[PDB]
Amino acid sequence: SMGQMLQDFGKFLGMFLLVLFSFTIGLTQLYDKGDCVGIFCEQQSNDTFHSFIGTCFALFWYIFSLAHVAIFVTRFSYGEELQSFVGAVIVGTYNVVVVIVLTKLLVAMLHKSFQLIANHEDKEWKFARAKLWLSYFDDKCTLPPPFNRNLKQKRDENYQKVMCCLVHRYLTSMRQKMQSTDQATVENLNELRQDLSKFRNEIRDLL
Amino acid sequence: EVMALKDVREVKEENTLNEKLFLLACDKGDYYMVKKILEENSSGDLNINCVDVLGRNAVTITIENENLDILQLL
Amino acid sequence: RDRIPLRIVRAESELSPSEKAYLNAVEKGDYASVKKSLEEAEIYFKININCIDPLGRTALLIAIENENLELIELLLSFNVYVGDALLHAIRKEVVGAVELLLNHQFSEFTPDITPIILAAHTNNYEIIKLLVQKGVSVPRPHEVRCNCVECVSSSDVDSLRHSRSRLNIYKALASPSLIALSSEDPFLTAFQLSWELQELSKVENEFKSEYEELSRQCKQFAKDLLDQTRSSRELEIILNYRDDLARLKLAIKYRQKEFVAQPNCQQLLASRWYDEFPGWRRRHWAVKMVTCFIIGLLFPVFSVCYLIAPKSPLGLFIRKPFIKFICHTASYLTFLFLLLLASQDLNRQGPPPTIVEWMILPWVLGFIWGEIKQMWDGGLQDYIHDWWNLMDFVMNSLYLATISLKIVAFVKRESWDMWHPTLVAEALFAIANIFSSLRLISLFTANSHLGPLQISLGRMLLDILKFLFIYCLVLLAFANGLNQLYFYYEELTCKGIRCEKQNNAFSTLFETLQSLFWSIFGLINLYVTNVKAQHEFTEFVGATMFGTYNVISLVVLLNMLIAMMNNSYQLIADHADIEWKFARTKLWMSYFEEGGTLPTPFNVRAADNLRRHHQYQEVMRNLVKRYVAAMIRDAKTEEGLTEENFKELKQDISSFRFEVLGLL
Amino acid sequence: DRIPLRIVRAESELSPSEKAYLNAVEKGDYASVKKSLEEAEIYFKININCIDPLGRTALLIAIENENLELIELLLSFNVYVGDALLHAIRKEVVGAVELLLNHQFSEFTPDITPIILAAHTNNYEIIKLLVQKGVSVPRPHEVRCNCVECVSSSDVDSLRHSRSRLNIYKALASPSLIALSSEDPFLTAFQLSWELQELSKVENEFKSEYEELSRQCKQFAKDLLDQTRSSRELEIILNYRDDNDLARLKLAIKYRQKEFVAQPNCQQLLASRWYDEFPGWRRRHWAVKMVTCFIIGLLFPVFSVCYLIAPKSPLGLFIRKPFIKFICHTASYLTFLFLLLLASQHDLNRQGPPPTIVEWMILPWVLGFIWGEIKQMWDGGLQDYIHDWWNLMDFVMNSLYLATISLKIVAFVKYSNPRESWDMWHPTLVAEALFAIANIFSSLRLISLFTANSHLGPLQISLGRMLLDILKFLFIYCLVLLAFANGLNQLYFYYEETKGLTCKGIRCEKQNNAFSTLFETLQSLFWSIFGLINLYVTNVKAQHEFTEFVGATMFGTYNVISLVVLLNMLIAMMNNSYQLIADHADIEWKFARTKLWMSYFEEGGTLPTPFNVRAADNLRRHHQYQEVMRNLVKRYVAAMIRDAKTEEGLTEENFKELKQDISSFRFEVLGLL
Amino acid sequence: EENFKELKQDISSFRFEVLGLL
Amino acid sequence: TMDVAPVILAAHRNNYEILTMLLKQDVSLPKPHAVGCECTLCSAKNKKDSLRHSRFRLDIYRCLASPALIMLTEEDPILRAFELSADLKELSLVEVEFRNDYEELA
Amino acid sequence: YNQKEFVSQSNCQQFLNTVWFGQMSGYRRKPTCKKIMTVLTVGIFWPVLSLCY
Ligand SMILES: CCCCCCCCCCCCCCCC(=O)OC[C@H](COP(=O)(O)O)OC(=O)CCCCCCCCCCCCCCC
Ligand SMILES: CCCCCCCCCCCCCCCC(=O)OC[C@H](COP(=O)(O)O)OC(=O)CCCCCCCCCCCCCCC
Ligand SMILES: CCCCCCCCCCCCCCCC(=O)OC[C@H](COP(=O)(O)O)OC(=O)CCCCCCCCCCCCCCC
Ligand SMILES: CC(C)CCC[C@@H](C)[C@H]1CC[C@H]2[C@@H]3CC=C4C[C@@H](OC(=O)CCC(=O)O)CC[C@]4(C)[C@H]3CC[C@]12C
Ligand SMILES: CC(C)CCC[C@@H](C)[C@H]1CC[C@H]2[C@@H]3CC=C4C[C@@H](OC(=O)CCC(=O)O)CC[C@]4(C)[C@H]3CC[C@]12C
Ligand SMILES: [Ca+2]
Ligand SMILES: [Ca+2]
């Protein structure tokens, strides 16, 4: 089920990558005018937003909402209040759009995908297990990784006999299902009324 | 201000009473007046291909009723 | 008192044993017994023809739901009173309604119900056809927003009766049989009726479900009427009908997401989308990407054509809607790459450089001109309905503000004021870059995988904003409380929450709002609730407020948002496919037009009408014939029995039994 | 350029006279079949065994329709009979007495006998006729066997053996056969559901079939209990033992019959036995109930010593009420947790004795808990002890308490100095740590008391049901964690330093050496879910930017795979699990609450923890139980026929029977006139 | 199925009454 | 709709006796083209009526995917069912407008 | 051909189980402790079995 539902993660990963790219462009454009450099430091300096790959790094650690990148990295080093406040508002908008919108959307799509998937999870598991078993059924690859006509006509006749038997059994079974499980319709009632009116007219003509 | 409803497209033609009698006896299984109406059709008082309100002929009506004897007669 | 003495409070009037015998004689279906009872009812005796059961069943009605046509003829021959018996026959769906029409207090049906209204509520094609052959008319309701003397007089007399009568009228008009029978253009009638019913559902707070289901029924009727097309000539006759795909644009205007997103109409739209380029569906995805990249990368050469010689084959290559869409997306990608290069001498005012911010200006001017051109067509209603148009307006406003501020700085670091025009200009440039790069979300509707996800996202943004309203209320409450508590302790190299050592987090209302906003992500530390005055009680009370706000906004409201998003997505995903196809064909018809085909850096008689009307009328009568045939063969069979049909079958065998006994 | 369509499965098309015979017996007329059979007597083109290519022999067509006169007509002509009795049994025609009293593709599996198919159809009448005639179902072996006959049959033909065993168990598990032919239908249903559950466990294939059969047996047992219309009959049913005990109720709990136990009648009986001598407690006002429960809670030791010194006194008999006993046990456990809380409230002693204020009266309570667990393990066996997770938690906490006691007496008689200079494996420190873990387990045992309450009960049961899915996902997360931990350990163990640091690890202010060893890598990757690991722990002191980038990339990949992917997958999967298990929350909550109730029904183990440390009668019991079973089975088969003839779905074969009846009537009057 | 059994019983009763008449 | 035949409609209703007595006479149904076939025959009927061409292909594949026709005219019903399910799935992938009918046929 | 329903049929699954377990048909009826013991014994001396083959 998880392997089946990873496609939802990919389809949503595209949208999140586009949103991340947009906010990375904005923060890099705003903050480019401004030892250990980046977010992988004891004191994460403002220089994390000074490059495109650094901005992608900084906005990547904002997804988990676990204070991996602190908010003082959005402060200019020389006291520009408007630019620092605008960068803080941009980072807050990014954090809202990711954490409080996109993550919950992903949870909702995973809800729908898992409710659809769990109906037939046994069948897919049995198919995958049969593939895994058929990978080991052959004798061409036996040792582990460290140490490494008349017959055709008889087979055709046997397969044709078995196929004819299966065809006969299937036909009788399915005609039993149409006779036993199909519900009546209004057409059946109309046909019954037609037969009754036929018998009434026959009685009228005879008597 | 009241919309006056009218039949925009003509679909059913009544014509004579024999066509309506044939249509009514087709979906009631009235075999003997059906064969009388067919004898009059052989005389030539009516047309075999009659269109009802539903647009179904006598063959379609008796096929819907699933009746083989009157269909064979038709 | 030990036992409850059950009695009959509504005593009514009982019937004589002779009258009861007559009534059960009609109920059983014996011809001779009812005939004899009406013979003694001919003379002025106890048995009367106008006998009313305490259940309310007159003998004519008992004959009506027993489907005994001979008994109904026998009763009408003796002139029993006919009141709502025609209505009972209409609702019963018998073919005795014609002989009820051919003739000459407690009522089950409301007094506003006429035979045509109940026949259309029934949705029987035969009964409606016979009634309009006899001659009927549905009274025309007033406008959705009207102020008439008669309307307000009827509302003052009876608002319940007025609302019920209007609902019955609109239920009668919205029936598929009445539209397919009594309207010249069933598609336009269905479209306008669905629009009117949606506006009435908006206007009428009560009965909203009824009008909504009536509009859904009209849309479904339009979809099943379009489903009867078996030829592309008929489809091109219908969709191009104007009284260019005029009817398709009309259906997009009326938000008919079932007429649209039909496989025949979608196949026609896909044929128009890949104009003169077959085999595109028969290709590999890598070849798809390679062809898309090699057409997008060569876009300015294509845009050079049709600017001088539109009659060239390369000038007609841009006329293909798919190639035009690819060229537009490549132009937007080039503009975004120019923005990227702009993002990648410290003077007070700065002229734009040569490589970037000078080459960008034709794109911005073309975007403004295109926004004005799209504002010209369709008015301001479609501009404010489409949220992407609002996003484009905001982005262009930010761009023009940036240009104006740059001009003001030009002709009028670490030293300027924070209110300086250059700083504001670059901040607005960054925000406009965010908006311009976020515009690319709208490109996902063309793709078959990222389309429905984005459509569902845009569908549930309204619910998200509805939740954000109550969250902002909670935030305002807790911010007011924390600011009231903590503003007596206010004090510094860096004041606020955006420093390494956070201080004065709740000293002002703005800082309190910022700290409570950042507390969702855990970016506000725990020492910000500690004052330097060593008042441990107020510190504990402020920390308790912070904890209560964190609980409400994280354990409670966030998971509440999760649950309601799950419910909203489950509701959306049923019709997400048709919603995505509606958005995709809107995007396709945005490029189907022959106007505004240039990309952004370069965009700065009665006889033929009668023949078209005759062709459309022939196609329409063929379509409604196929539709009534499909409804006949889907309604007369493949539908469960009621308890009545068996009851009718029982009356038939019983009447046959008494007829046989009378014969012998 | 066009696909040719030719009949490959070729069959004989018979003769037009035989087609006339077939449509004559399809229409249902009497004279035409007479004429055809008389022509077949003089060897016309019509034969009696006219094999339709669909297998519709004229006997089978006459059996499919419910016209017994035509059935007797072709049975009087010596028409060859094969599986036509099985066809009449499957068709559920009561007129199988003619087929019973008379004298390879076959539409049925070759081991199917008439009794097996009659039990499959679940028709009481046909089963009654077949048992009256004399039938025998082969006895299946038990679930796990290695006898030579079964392994020989499986070696010869495993599919046929599995189908035959499934058919036999389908026949035995039918409600009609159990109601008609079993001595004790309740015991038969319980044991049959147990064997079908075990067979579903063993047979991985046909798991749904055996699970459906077990659910059918449980549903039959619930319906048979539903027909009790007196309290005397319910007391006879529930107290019956094969050899006021409620032995059959205990057997149904043992066989995991949740629907049988959660039936409202036995629920009311268990509530009456629960509130022993409590007039109007179930309708009392709620805060009055709370005040009275508090009053009995503070009065547990006086009742306990009253039971100690005078069990015959009314004060000593007040503890014999199961609700009062439960209240006193909960009050005792609350006193134990209060003492545990007082242990922490209000040293440099290397050999610290237990303080007399708190710890000295903790020891007898630990001995009482251990003795109670030993007594519970002795009386009931070890399988039911390991089936309950709370018993495992209690065993863990008692083992921890015993280890704490042993370490304390070891630290008293040996290793007899400031606190900061002690060894890191000092026995006093280990005793304190194990005491803290045992305190956590003891205070976490309070969630088992939520089952008694009607509001927190189903919620606690649902959380316990979702704990299994929690562990199932934790296995996958643990595999991911070991993968990324070994990767980060292999990358980062070269950059391990001491540098005179007082800290080495992630558990202090300056986080360092996060991925130096595998243990520290596992700890650092464990704490990344909660965001207590900072970003600078992926940095080395050297100027190696490539290894730092690889470590940051692997850390970010692990963070994505856990938090974004696996946590949201877990949220969706437990969303689905709670949607699935909330439909049946009431029956499992009532089952668990009844298990808790009859935990306090027995006379043994009455005292709380600090003070815990013949033939004629059996024959008349069998007669009474058999008469109650006769009444219950009669009511159940009556209701089975009532509910069965009011099935709201009408098929299409009955319309064909109506057509055949109308056509036969029409042909009969046409022959008469 | 109750009303189907009612139909069968009613048709059988009519058939047997017709047989009794003739 | 005119593109059907008695054999096509009989396979559409999935009636075994009607099909097996319509197969007593010699009946041939038109072989549909491959999912990648773009020859002149496939590029002439679509221009005349693409809707009729699509409905005709859908009706042919609905007739072929009927169980009873697989019993009556094929030597190996299992292999025919396998290959037909694969072909209908790739047709649903190719024919994006009519993918629901092809998916339900697979 | 991605026939998931054909593969997940109980007859096909039982046949797959019989082919998969081979000559050790008693493993399916063995108790769980014997099953883990068999798995551990076959897994511990895997190079011995490989070299002996
Ligand atoms: C074995 C099965 C395990 C479970 C299934 C796993 C499926 C695959 C999981 C995703 C792919 C691996 C992780 C890819 C990310 C990565 O490696 O990212 C790792 C790096 C970390 O770099 P730094 O540590 O230097 O910042 O990220 C970057 O380089 C930043 C720029 C690229 C950003 C890509 C972000 C992708 C989106 C991931 C989060 C989505 C959030 C959506 C909810 C809001
Ligand atoms: C891309 C497609 C997906 C997203 C589509 C759009 C939906 C999301 C739209 C987000 C719009 C911006 C959000 C506000 C950010 C902001 O104003 O952030 C800007 C500032 C932050 O300022 P600083 O960063 O300087 O501290 O916020 C404040 O000043 C505090 C007061 C306003 C708080 C507004 C909070 C609105 C609700 C957001 C939190 C919801 C939590 C709910 C918990 C249950
Ligand atoms: C606004 C409408 C919507 C919300 C309606 C109300 C619903 C929410 C009501 C919350 C009421 C406050 C709850 C207690 C918080 C508090 O005041 O907490 C306040 C204090 C915090 O003290 P300091 O901040 O001084 O450390 O908590 C404590 O003192 C610790 C002991 C009490 C802990 C109680 C915890 C209760 C559970 C809360 C967390 C649940 C997490 C579950 C995870 C699975
Ligand atoms: C980060 C950005 C600035 C550059 C790298 C990403 C782009 C190369 C991608 C991102 C989104 C892509 C678009 C997303 C969706 C589509 C629809 C898709 O075409 C269709 O689906 C056509 C209609 C159909 O097939 O029915 C391919 C082109 C296009 C515009 C894509 C073109 C390439 C785009 C712009
Ligand atoms: C720090 C120590 C003192 C523990 C603090 C918490 C306790 C005082 C609470 C926690 C859970 C409570 C229990 C939760 C549920 C119930 C069930 C309820 O009783 C019933 O429902 C009885 C059965 C019935 O009424 O049918 C009230 C008592 C009891 C045991 C409660 C007793 C008091 C408990 C143990
Ligand atoms: Ca726009
Ligand atoms: Ca225990």
Ligand SMILES: [Zn+2]
């Ligand atoms: Zn008005």
Ligand SMILES: [Zn+2]
């Ligand atoms: Zn055995």
Ligand SMILES: [Zn+2]
């Ligand atoms: Zn071709």
